[PDB]
Amino acid sequence: YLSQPRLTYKTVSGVNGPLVILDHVKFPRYAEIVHLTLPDGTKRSGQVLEVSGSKAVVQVFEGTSGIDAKKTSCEFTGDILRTPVSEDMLGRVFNGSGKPIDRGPVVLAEDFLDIMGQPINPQCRIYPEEMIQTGISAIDGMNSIARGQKIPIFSAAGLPHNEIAAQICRQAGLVKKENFAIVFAAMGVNMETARFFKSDFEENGSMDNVCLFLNLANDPTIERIITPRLALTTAEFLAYQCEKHVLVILTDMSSYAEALREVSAAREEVPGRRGFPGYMYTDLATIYERAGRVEGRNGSITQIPILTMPNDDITHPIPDLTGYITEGQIYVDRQLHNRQIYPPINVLPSLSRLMKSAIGEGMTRKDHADVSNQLYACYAIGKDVQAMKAVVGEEALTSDDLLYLEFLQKFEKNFITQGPYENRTVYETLDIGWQLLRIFPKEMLKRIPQSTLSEFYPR
Amino acid sequence: YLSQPRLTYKTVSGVNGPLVILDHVKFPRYAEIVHLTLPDGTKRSGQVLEVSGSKAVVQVFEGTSGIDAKKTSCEFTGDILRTPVSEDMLGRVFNGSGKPIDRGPVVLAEDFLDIMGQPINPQCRIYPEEMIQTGISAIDGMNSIARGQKIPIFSAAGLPHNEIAAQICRQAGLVKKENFAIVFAAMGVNMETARFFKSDFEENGSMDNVCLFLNLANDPTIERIITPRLALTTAEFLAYQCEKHVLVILTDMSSYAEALREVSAAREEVPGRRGFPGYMYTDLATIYERAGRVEGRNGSITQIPILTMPNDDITHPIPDLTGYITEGQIYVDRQLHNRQIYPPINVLPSLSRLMKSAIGEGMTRKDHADVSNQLYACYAIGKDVQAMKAVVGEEALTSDDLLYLEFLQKFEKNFITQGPYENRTVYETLDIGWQLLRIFPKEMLKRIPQSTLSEFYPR
Amino acid sequence: KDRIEIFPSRMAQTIMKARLKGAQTGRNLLKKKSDALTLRFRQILKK
Amino acid sequence: TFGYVHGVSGPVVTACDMAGAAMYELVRVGHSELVGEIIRLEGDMATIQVYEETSGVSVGDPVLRTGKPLSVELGPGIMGAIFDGIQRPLSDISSQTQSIYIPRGVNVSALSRDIKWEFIPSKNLRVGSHITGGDIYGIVNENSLIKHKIMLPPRSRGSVTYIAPPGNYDASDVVLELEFEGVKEKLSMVQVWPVRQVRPVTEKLPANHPLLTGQRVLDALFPCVQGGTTAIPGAFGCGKTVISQSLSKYSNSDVIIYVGCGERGNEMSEVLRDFPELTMEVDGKVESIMKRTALVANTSNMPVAAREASIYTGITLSEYFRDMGYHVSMMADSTSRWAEALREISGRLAEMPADSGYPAYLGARLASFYERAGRVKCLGNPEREGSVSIVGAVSPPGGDFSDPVTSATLGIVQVFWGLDKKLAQRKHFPSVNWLISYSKYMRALDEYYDKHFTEFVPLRTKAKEILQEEEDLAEIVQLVGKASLAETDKITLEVAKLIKDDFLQQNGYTPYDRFCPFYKTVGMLSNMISFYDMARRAVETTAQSDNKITWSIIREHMGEILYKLSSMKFKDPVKDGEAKIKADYAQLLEDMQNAFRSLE
Amino acid sequence: ALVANTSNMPVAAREASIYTGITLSEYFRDMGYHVSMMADSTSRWAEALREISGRLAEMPADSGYPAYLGARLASFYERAGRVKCLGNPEREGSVSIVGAVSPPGGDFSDPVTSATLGIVQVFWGLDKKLAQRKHFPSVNWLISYSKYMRALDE
Amino acid sequence: FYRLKKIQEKKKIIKEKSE
């Protein structure tokens, strides 16, 4: 451990935006944490993002409003932000800084883990080969979720992505025909959103297995880029040291991206798109890739990094860079919501990069993959038919086109529409798939081999 | 004779990318040359970019890898890179810095010339007139090339601009009623292309009059900044002192422009559009304008530089600044290439400034100018008709529009399409032109005087 | 497909605005043609 | 022999008291001895690019100056192993630290020094013999698939003074002793080569042999060659990683070097799990795939600086095997992540950026990387022939093929396998656009195709014309509503759909589409084109008669043929071999010809 | 009497060429002669200003041009007009200036086109589509203007 | 904008060094 006394400085050189620059610092350490007291007794903290000679640049989390130049007192802890972690954090509510806000005590640590974490050795990483039953046909059928998979929900302001995430928390099981520890990072949200989840977790009777981290809209914007790391760091303790299956949900990741963009502008870093740092991808990977199973240990971490798409722009850097890192997305839209369809999940622009291994013989039912692929073909074609019919009129369509409009209409109301408390099994979902596929003659089901049609289609 | 011993310095200040900064230098000369000896004995050269006091910034041509800041020895030549030139440089292959790569000896310095160029007095410049018969109907018919012209070929990546340039080289000649020497500067050219041209010159028996300067894509990127100046310096010796006619081919001014950008950025200069130095215009003008004829000489230099257009546009600073300097272009398109048309040259955005004077009675045919204009207008209209057809349908066109559509299709098939191993004369090209013009009734050929129509049209 | 695929530029911005105005005028003029035909159609169907 | 750290800005560390340090020398920064490489020299201060996380590094930490540049260890023990971005074996780290995390500052030999290799000399050398760079003076049997040739390193030569007899030797022993001018050199099985320097070859040759890909499209229409370079600039979800994995699993290359530079960690695990379960018969014996592959993992959440070392380490390994007479087909599944690393470092360096924040020298790095590919005549008296192909992914933001990396890449690579996100959304995999893609090796392979097939080339041409005509029509049909279409156009539109749905797309996670042997691709294409010609003829000869065979007549009359043609993909070449597939395709051709005779 | 300066001449002479030309024009203007000065290009002059502005490391404005580009063009363009000359003879001469803006396109956002339009009284814009149709002279007739109508009405 | 900002900052840094 660190036995040497820490030094306290009153040597602040100057302040520029959110960065407090100190001079005359003895052997500055990069990425060490500094605690500072303002002339009025206010305590704040920050991290050294740069060292040079006797100078060090400290980014203050709470902010730099009121920071003095002569009376400011800073001390260097001598290490990086290592945070206390314990098993009994489940059932506790923390803020974005890692402190309790539930009137309970501080964390009685079992160890201290580096918030930056470590990359998992790809040689010991074990490919996910287990399916989670979300109960939502729009997911379990056409975009299955594996245990250890990274699947954000791409949404837009005003859509019920918070209800879908809440629903998943209660009715997420296994298809092996199980209590997940949930870590919920509520960052950049209003009180009502955070209270919605907290109340739902108590309503579900699962609060003793839920750890919350809150950083609300009225909280500092710099803490909003450590909250995910605090949640995931706890998840790593639980999953990889205590072999507990953990589900980690990160609320609108766009508030993370905006908090990061502000820091990037403040430090004058090289922009990429829309003003975001050119290293945004690397930073997101640091957050996202803290997931998956590890060979030889019985734990797992599953992530659902839900994010709001600015102006429904699917190519915005936030969903774009996420789409490159995560194993696909669920993606909801306004076209379904504006018709009172719940869940408003649009399968066409969605995918699950692990689905090919989590379904089929020995996992669910051998026709699973075939049903999904044909449903995708029929759904997309029905959308193509509407795009045509909007101009040419119904009279310009033939029987080959009307079948896809019948499929599309029955598909959305039978397959996607369920309701907040409709919990379907994966087997029921496939049976529904067939009921829609039986709208077409065998010859048109061109994504399914005759070795499958001959067995399932007649029923 | 500069019989003064050279100074060698170890007073290296630092190395930053392609730039080496020296200090304590006695009376630095601007644009001087420094020979660098690396600690391991490797010898390299560079040219001074700026001097100030006792400091100088040296541009290292072969690269800076391996240079330290303690032992590297810097020998100042005391002069400007004046390059050895000889009339017997033909039948030789040199690398990007003018050194033998063909297992031959170092060129014997028949004389030296300053590669920076010696400006030619516009009063003594002789206006070009004689037409070069390239064999390509898109050029000999419409955008003809005069001897001494400056007509680069624009293209985007993947288009057959190397085949067109090679075809022009072996089919080059004058309109008859003896041949060219080739100076070929390869800048950032891949090995597959390098052997393409080298083999074509050998197979056609041209090597007796070809001098190659090869700076390949895998060679140093700073060296190629002088490569084009070394090529033209030799062309100027051969054309203006040895009374030869020289055709100069520059394989890519875009890789050259990138090399300038790398240096410009390295010295933290204020950029203009898309990050390129604000002086790109001058750096190009000093190369492109090394062309034409001079009073008292019988030789000439004709330039046909090639430029890859980033993103398939023609507003990129590189082709934009070139267009302002050179006397038209060929502009190889992509829409013609995708349709298996060769040469895929688009006649509308491409012009030849000297065409109006290098044709007509006494040079080609009385009607040359009239045929060109009428064909151009017919093609332009056909494209506007095609643009309409794509919206209104083939059933919404009048009889005249159909004539232009028929012209458009037959024009590209019979006139533009040629093949790489067939040459057609200017008179054969015009006869084909007439075959296309005779699609229209005489009343619609509004850009040809009635006297011209009556002489040729009914034939 | 989704875009006309003209490289971003101030020139392209100007062209697209002129192209949009043309398309909007065509829409309105053809809509008026349809309305005139519809009235007569309803006139002739009434007859 | 040490400097001292002056400052840290992240992946870039500034050090002082390094007056004698050269560019691109390795250094050990910090008390954990982190691996880095010198980028800039400013007086006696050096700018260091550090390939490991710099958190915890203090000002004043020692910096060891190492004279050797960033280099790769080349010798037996590479194949079947997985390396990190600087050639530290992950199976050896995990076997020694017992951890699941990769520690920082790990100093592990690239190639194990405990393995006793089976070594046989060439039996053609004697003491006093003159040996030159690239010569092979023995072979090590790494496994049953790849014979590991022990070469004299380039820039070394002399007379042989001792050659190890056949026997069991490890990588720390002396196999060959040679002398040049008094100076004697002792060589083991492992040579060291700077990773940023191109290994020398006798001659770079044209590529005149296909690089077989287990895909119908990406082969029949847009061939790649041994030694060629291609790019796959797909948007997320387009399936470019699957195309890369498919090529790795099922190709005619001898060695695959797979570089995961910024890739998701789960993808590298998928290879390690799945590949051992694949088979490739050698000489009547079933063997695993991993014995002929090697892979490098530098995942997205690893140090960003290491992304540059990973790319160059991979290609350096590829050249090593190229020199031994093997055909190598490396694939780096990112490219954009490497250019991204260059941007991030350039930012920390405060360099003047060029297009979209990228360094001005981006094009220089890509050009020199891709030009190391190619079919070559190797250096070395034994006259080997090898190749390195590069199949590199690119990740344009938003799928917009306008970024400096996609743009620069397209100016370098000779094969363009463009992917269309709108095809992936429809699960039309592989999501190849087939309108913007091209291959510049068509002419090079025309000789091959005529020699072995002949029928393929006119089929390739007709298929492209049909797809282009469908696009030309689709543009106007969207506006007309299929009202003005001629009967000859309706056939084109429907056959083009037939080609699109049954020929261009295939499900790579099935027993029948996981690999598509070339003879099957050309076989089923011949039938589809034969239908086109017969159906088009049927209407052309009857349209002016007293009964025109419109689409509705042929469609109802030959509905069984159209279904059979669509079923042609479901042939399972492993269960049903060549004989049954060719006989089956011949039967469909006979069925079509007989139906037409009864129709017309 | 013409002044010859090619694109491969030094940027400083490229800038000064316009000033040399107009100096000769005013010289003869003061003789009572009617002088007509033709420019080949003012975009090349503006290009020289952009190149030098960069080399001097002074803060640029739109598209890399100096913020004072408009001042340089106004200074040149306003050195013209019918005048009463100095000197006892009471002679009266004139200078006409015909500028020439090379069009990167028909978008008048072009800093040089825009600055010129704010100064010049007559603008003879050349239409791209009429040029493509080989209709000569190619004049738009819709975007052009001349502000001397009322002056010439007399 | 980004490049111009860094240019202005580099000019300020150069000026300070000269004093």
Ligand SMILES: Nc1ncnc2c1ncn2[C@@H]1O[C@H](COP(=O)(O)OP(=O)(O)O)[C@@H](O)[C@H]1O
């Ligand atoms: N060729 C293919 N055959 C079958 N499925 C494919 C194919 N390509 C992609 N897919 C499916 O789509 C997903 C997306 O492919 P992936 O390689 O992960 O995308 P990316 O382009 O982002 O690398 C795969 O995980 C798989 O489910």
